[PDB]
């Protein structure tokens, strides 16, 4: 019944700043530390910050001090990080958690990307299906920057079978990758397959119904 | 600032085995060591507290041993399930620390791939490139070798290969093999052909289609 939802990740220029939310429900918040904890693309794990129950004690590591700044507002039920003076090494999915030692919740990230490059939206094409049986099918997502994007099938009812592959970083600067699903046969003239792409960082949603 | 090592990078184990994972602080933390299970494109979840300590919900055949410097997170009984990233963290004094994560990886019976091959769609080769796609679906162990022909010429250089992780349910991987062509390229040859070499399969297994039908 904990819950932990971040909002606010975005590509941000080398120097620039962006502020972070947590938004807590299910548990007593103001009877909690609350800490922030990144990974960055090597999936590596780094603890940024912690603010204690009241807000009147906080830590950080000697990478971020200065830069960051954890706050709380018990009122509303939320935790932020401030971030500025933002640098390249700062680039990774961010993670609002409970408690200040140990995290027994973790939300689920929000992302940010330092860089002076341009966000750029995803083009979507079908990957087009059809003895039988089961059939494949799928969406390529290509020429998109940053990471990440999301892929959901006919809006996240559709799960069984689907396989999302990790984006590749492409000669142009921008990231491609497809998701397929294998579905019956019998059911390509009847049953309607649509995939769901969000790229947040460029505001784009794209939903592609892939027919034979 | 107290560092929590990971010398495993991975760890294999079958369904129903156990396998073990350590974890070493650089100077003595006491039990405040904490265990978390990353599941493919989730966020970490919480395992182990106090070096032993299993969080209401948690399995007891998740278990976490060590006093000091020397950590262990054993997972009895594993399941296809506990495919995931473990890491360690210890919170003796800040700055928290974790370690670099360790992949437990399941071992399973041979499965062959089905193979499927995707040409360009119209709406792709509007803009000047063409994508074509070779999906291998569903297969066990990982290696797999996949081959592009046009019009019998093997291509090298100009294809990109991605891979999920191990399936939660049958443990399997699925790649895709990407063929990027200028569309110009792309209209100067006929027959387009994956060919796919893996244990599972007799003999390689070859999905093509010709350009324009």
């Known amino acids: 019944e904990v819950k932990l939802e971040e909002s606010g990740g975005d590509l941000v220029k080398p120097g620039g700043s962006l502020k972070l939310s947590c938004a807590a429900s299910?548990?007593?918040?103001?009877?909690?530390?609350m800490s922030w904890v990144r990974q960055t693309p090597d999936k590596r794990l780094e603890w940024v910050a912690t603010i204690s129950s009241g807000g009147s004690y906080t830590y950080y590591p000697d990478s971020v001090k200065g830069r960051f700044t954890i706050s709380r507002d018990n009122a509303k039920n939320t935790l932020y990080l401030q971030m500025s003076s933002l640098k390249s090494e700062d680039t990774a999915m961010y993670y609002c958690?409970?408690?200040?030692?140990?995290?027994?919740?973790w939300g689920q990230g929000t992302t940010l990307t330092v860089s002076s490059a341009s966000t750029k939206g995803p083009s979507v094409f079908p990957l087009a299906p059809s003895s039988g049986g089961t059939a494949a099918l799928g969406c390529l997502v290509k020429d998109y920057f940053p990471e990440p994007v999301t892929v959901s099938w006919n809006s996240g009812a559709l799960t069984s079978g689907v396989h999302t592959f990790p984006a590749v970083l492409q000669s142009s600067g921008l990231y491609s990758l497809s998701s397929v699903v294998t579905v019956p046969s019998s059911s390509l003239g009847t049953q309607t397959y649509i995939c769901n792409v969000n790229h947040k960082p460029s505001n784009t949603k794209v939903d592609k119904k892939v027919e034979p | 600032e107290t560092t929590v090592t990971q010398s495993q990078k991975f760890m294999s184990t079958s369904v129903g085995d156990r396998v073990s994972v350590t974890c070493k602080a650089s100077?003595?933390?006491?039990?405040?060591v904490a265990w978390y299970q990353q599941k493919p494109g989730q966020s970490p979840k919480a395992l182990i507290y106090?070096?032993?300590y299993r969080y209401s919900g948690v399995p007891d055949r998740f278990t976490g041993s060590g006093s000091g410097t020397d950590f262990t997170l054993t997972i009895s009984n594993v399941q296809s399930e506990d495919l995931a990233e473990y890491f360690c963290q210890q919170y003796n004094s800040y700055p928290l620390t974790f370690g670099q994560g360790t992949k437990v990886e399941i071992k399973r019976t041979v499965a062959a791939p089905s193979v499927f091959i995707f040409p360009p769609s119209d709406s792709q080769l509007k803009s000047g490139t063409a994508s074509v796609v070779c999906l291998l679906n569903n297969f066990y162990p990982r290696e797999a070798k996949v081959q592009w022909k046009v019009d019998n010429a093997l291509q090298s250089g100009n294809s990109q290969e991605s891979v999920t992780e191990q399936d939660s349910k049958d443990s399997t991987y699925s790649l895709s093999s990407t063929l990027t062509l200028s569309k110009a390229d792309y209209e100067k040859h006929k027959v387009y052909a994956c060919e796919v070499t893996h244990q599972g399969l007799s003999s390689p297994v070859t999905k093509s289609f010709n350009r324009g039908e």
């Open positions: 958690a409970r408690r200040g030692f140990y995290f027994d919740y």
């Open positions: 299910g548990f007593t918040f103001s009877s909690y530390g």
């Open positions: 106090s070096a032993s």
């Open positions: 100077q003595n933390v006491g039990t405040n």
